[PDB]
Structure formats: C-alpha cells, structure tokens
Amino acid sequence: MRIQVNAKGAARLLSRHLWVFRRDVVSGPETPGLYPVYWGRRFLALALYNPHTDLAVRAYRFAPAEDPVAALLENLAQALARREAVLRQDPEGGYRLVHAEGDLLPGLVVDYYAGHAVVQATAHAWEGLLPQVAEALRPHVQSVLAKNDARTRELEGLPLYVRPLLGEVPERVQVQEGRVRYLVDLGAYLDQRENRLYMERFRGERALDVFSYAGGFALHLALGFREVVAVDSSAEALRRAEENARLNGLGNVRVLEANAFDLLRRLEKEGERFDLVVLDPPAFAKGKKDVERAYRAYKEVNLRAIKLLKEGGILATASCSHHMTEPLFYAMVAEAAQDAHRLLRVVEKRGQPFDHPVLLNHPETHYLKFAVFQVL
C-alpha cells in the first residue's frame, strides 16, 4: 500500500513538518496503519495513517526502512534512551518518556511518575501496538497504565477506556521534584517541572501562587517565602495541595479556593500586595476563535497580578495553549505591564524542558511559555 499526496503535501514533508491533511492526499490505503508516503514515485516518508480523519498523515521517518513497524518501535527506543540517563540519576522524579511528534512518535504520549508509566495513544495505528510499547517500558517501570479516555481518540475511530498494560498500577504515588514531593492519581504537569525548580531561587515575605492545582509552585516557594497562598477552582485540587503540603512538612502554605479573576481584582482593592506572584492558567481557548477572547483573559489576570506586586517584586507568568503563540503571549504581558503603568525588567524567558522536545519545522510541538519579570 502507498500514500499519494499532491504538490502541497509533498512540500510540507520536504520542509520536514510531519502532518499532511486530508485535502492534500490523493490516494491512500483502505485502512489505518503504517504506510510509506509518495509524491508520484518519489519516496517522502514512513507514517501513521488514518483514512477517516482530516489529519491523515503523521510522518515518523523521512527515509525508507526495511520494516515500517521496526522503524517506529526504533524511534521509541531512541526516545526512551534520551531519558534513562536522567531516569537513573533521579528514579523518583516525574519525567515525560514520549512526547509524540517531538520524539518522532506521532499520536503517542508516555509519562513517567517515578516508576509508574502512563501511556496515551491518540493515533489509530498505535492502539494495536500498545503491547510492544509496554515491552520497552518494563526495564524502567514498576507498572504501565493505559489512559486512553481522551475525547480526541474518538476522531480516530478508537474506543475510550483506561487499564493496566503491565504489573499492578497503584491508585497514586509520590514524586521527588527537587527539594519537594507531590502525589499523582494513577495528575501532574511535568511541563512546568523545571520552571518550578527555577522558582526556588526567590526569597520574600508573601507569595501568591495563582492557578496552582496541587500547589506544585507553592511547595517550592514555601522554602523561601514566609507565607505562600495557593489558589485554584477545583477544591479537589487545593486538597491535594494541603496533602502535598503536610507531606513536605510545610505549614506556611494556606490554600484558597476561588475564581482567580474575582480574587485578584478584589485583593487589589483590599490593598493586598505581594512579593512574588505566579500565574499558570489553562488554555482559555479550545479553538482559533477563542484567541481573541483568550487574549483578554490572559491580559486581565496578568494586569491584575502586576498591580498586586510591590516595587521590586517578581512575576512568573505562563501559558500552555497552542493558540497563544509566543510573540502574542509576550505582547499581552507588555500590554498588561503597560496599562498597569509599571515597568517590568526581564528576569528570564524559558520554555519547555528537555523531556518535552520541540521541533522547529513543526510548530505544534511548541506550546509552553514561561517568563519571569521583576517589577520596578
């Protein structure tokens, strides 16, 4: 079987982007699987293919190989390899083992929560290879969970479920993130792992960790701040926080359930002023249409946090959405510091950690933005 694509799709794969959408496909196999892609009789790549989706082709190799399935399971080896050296030098931390496209393993995500792996396939061809994927994980895991309930799997013609693929997987587990530890529900945002560690270098009296979830940022901040106030919407989240709090021996970490948009503008009126504020909200946009409205949401919250800071305070602001490009994200923060009539010096601009790889030729692998500013 061969996948044929037009001149547009051919150029995309030659520029090294991995996706070819349906409208640029001419002919393709009858069923989902691993097939080679051509532009006439010129080989372009090997790929994960689905004939029933707008995103039809997902390249994982740009050179012909004897066995397409071997080549794939090969990328998985080299992807697990790039980690290991770190997996044995900190077997208790939380790291990503496979970051889909970024590791040339499209539609596959596999996270490591200190021994207990969690696989996540979202491309049809993977579903049947879950047993091989698990085989490569045993030399490092104590178990493997298949969390395939993603609503995204429905577009692929895949069933929604969740269940073990090796050993026995607990209900939860603790992760050693630097000088602190946290729990995961076999919940954890490994993307901000190294940015949370960055925050340990700051000292001060009051710190306000907004959109904190389980208080990942608060635990690190509690080590250098008199008081820390983790804020969130889901009461279930703040709870995991208090739990992570005591588990570390931290008393200076009071939580506070509420809607950040009301809590902030309010704290500004009551005269509340902090030494460091961390903002780490969620997408605010599911589609290219939310970009406009999302921009305002992000702006408000940042404008507000800036006003809550004392002269000299630190602002750590972030975004994880693929709809909030980096130039936009930074434009917004400047729009916020502008309206606030406050001058922010740039402390540092960070992105995604090494275990969440980014491919230049494939923009969609780049979503995390993390910046640290000092108000003057």
**Which tokens belong to 279?**
């903002």
Using CB under 8 A, which residues numbered 61 to 90 contact a copy of itself?
62
Catalytic, out of 320, 333, 337, 375: 320
Minimum distance of a copy of itself from residue 221's CB (angstroms): 21
Which residues, including other chains, have CB under 8 Å from residue 57's CB and lie 6 or more apart?
3, 5, 9, 13, 19, 20, 21, 25, 37, 47, 48, 49
Q: How many CA atoms lie within 13 A of 234 on its CB side?
A: 12
Measured distance CA(60)–CA(37) in Å, rounded: 11
- If the CB atoms of residues 24 and 209 are measured against ligand SAH, the closer one turns out to be 209
- If the CB atoms of residues 145 and 210 are measured against ligand SAH, the closer one turns out to be 210
In the list ligand SAH, a copy of itself, none, the entry touching 216 (Cβ below 5 to 8 angstroms by class) is ligand SAH
Q: Provide the β-strand partners of residue 172.
A: 185
Q: What is the DSSP letter of 66?
A: S
Measured distance CA(69)–CA(66) in Å, rounded: 9
Given the rule CB under 6 A, which of 26-34, 80-88, 210-218, 349-357 is the region that contacts ligand SAH? 210-218
232 binds ligand SAH (CB under 6 A): yes
**Of the candidates 148, 15, 176, the residue with the CA atom closest to the CA atom of residue 91:** 176
User: What burial class does residue 172 get, using C-beta atoms within 10 Å of its C-beta: 0-12 exposed, 13-18 middle, 19+ buried?
Assistant: middle
**Which tokens belong to 374?**
């000092």
**Which tokens belong to 190?**
């490994």
Using CB under 8 A, which residues numbered 295 to 334 contact a copy of itself?
326-327, 333-334
Question: Is 222 tagged catalytic?
Answer: no
Q: How many helices (H) and strands (E) does the chain have?
A: 10, 20
Minimum distance of a copy of itself from residue 306's CB (angstroms): 11
Minimum distance of a copy of itself from residue 344's CB (angstroms): 4
Q: Are strands 253-257 and 225-232 parallel, antiparallel or unpaired?
A: parallel
Q: Which residues carry a binding-site annotation for S-adenosyl-L-homocysteine?
A: 196, 211, 232-233, 259-260, 280
Minimum distance of a copy of itself from residue 320's CB (angstroms): 17
288 binds a copy of itself (CB under 8 A): no
Given the rule CB under 8 A, which of 10-18, 50-58, 134-142, 186-194 is the region that contacts a copy of itself? 10-18
Contact 72, 60 (CB under 8 A): yes
Query: What residues line the site for ligand SAH (CB under 6 A)?
Result: 189, 192, 196, 211-214, 216-217, 232-234, 237, 259-260, 280-282
Query: What residues line the site for a copy of itself (CB under 8 A)?
Result: 14-16, 62, 102, 104, 326-327, 333-334, 337-339, 341-346, 349, 351, 357-361, 366, 373, 376
**Catalytic sites, residue numbers:** 320
